[PDB]
Amino acid sequence: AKGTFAKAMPHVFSDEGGYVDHPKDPGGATNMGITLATLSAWEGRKVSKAEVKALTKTKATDIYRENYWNKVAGDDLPAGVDHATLDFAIHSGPARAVKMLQKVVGVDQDGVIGAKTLAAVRKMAADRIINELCDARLAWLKGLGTFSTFGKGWTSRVSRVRSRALAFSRDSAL
Ligand SMILES: CC(=O)N[C@@H]1[C@@H](O[C@H](C)C(=O)N[C@@H](C)C(=O)N[C@H](CCC(=O)O)C(=O)O)[C@H](O[C@@H]2O[C@H](CO)[C@@H](O)[C@H](O)[C@H]2NC(C)=O)[C@@H](CO)O[C@@H]1O
Structure with missing residues (x-):
């Protein structure tokens, strides 16, 4: 839904902080959550x-809008x-997220929201999609080698996302 972006992004910027560089961690340095490869x-x-x-907050916002929100068809x-x-x-990444959403709603996992994906999403309950996608995300993260280091924090992140998403799902202005 169109109005979710303005509601969600302040929580993203709040939860991210500024420049964070932990070179002993995979992924490399980030600013407001934006990695070097994404800025590249x-x-x-x-x-x-x-x-x-x-990196400026304006450019970070354009990156989140064009390369994440729009690449998962957030408006739709x-x-x-x-x-x-x-x-x-x-x-x-948007491809992995959309592939998992496609797995949840039962369509070909190609990583891009097309007509078949939108139809299957709109045939299911929204809070059911939210719960099944967050579960599928946790199951997928547990298969990564990095889960032994970041899994507990990842688990807490998904829990907070699931709560806010279910809340947004019953927000009358969305
Ligand atoms: C420790 C930790 O969680 N660091 C993350 C960091 O993610 C690191 C790289 C990570 O490991 N994420 C795990 C969940 C992951 O998905 N790993 C797979 C492995 C696949 C495989 O092993 O097969 C992968 O790396 O692809 C993440 O950056 C995102 O990383 C994605 C994947 O690279 C890109 O697609 C995104 O564009 C990029 N987002 C932006 C805004 O730039 C960043 C976002 O704010 O917040 C933390 O710093």
Whole structure:
């Protein structure tokens, strides 16, 4: 739903903070959650750590809007489903998030929201989609080698996303 983006993104920026660089962790340095590879994709060239450190909130917002929200068709997903899919997309990429949403609603997992995906999403209850997608996300994260390091924090993140998504799903302005 269109109005979810303005509601969800302040929580993303709040939960992320500014520049975070833990070089002993995989993924590399981030600013407001934006990684170096994602900024490189935006700029059309491999950027430096200093460029990530200097990232503006305006550019971060454009990146989240165009390369995450729009790549999961957030405007067109049901309220709540949009938020659950967006956070998964932020954490693991839009293709993996949409593939898991497609697995939940029972369509071909190609990572892109098309007509068959929208039809199957709108045939199911929104809070059921939210719960099954967050469960499928947890099951998928447990297969990663990095789960031994980040799993407890990941589990807490999914729980908070599931709660806010189900809330958005019953927000009368969405
Ligand atoms: C420790 C931790 O959670 N760090 C994450 C960090 O994610 C690291 C790289 C990660 O490991 N995420 C796990 C969940 C994951 O999905 N790993 C698979 C492994 C597949 C396999 O092993 O087969 C992968 O890396 O693909 C994540 O950055 C996102 O990383 C995705 C995957 O790279 C990109 O698609 C996204 O565009 C990118 N988002 C933005 C806004 O830039 C960032 C977001 O704020 O917040 C934390 O810093």
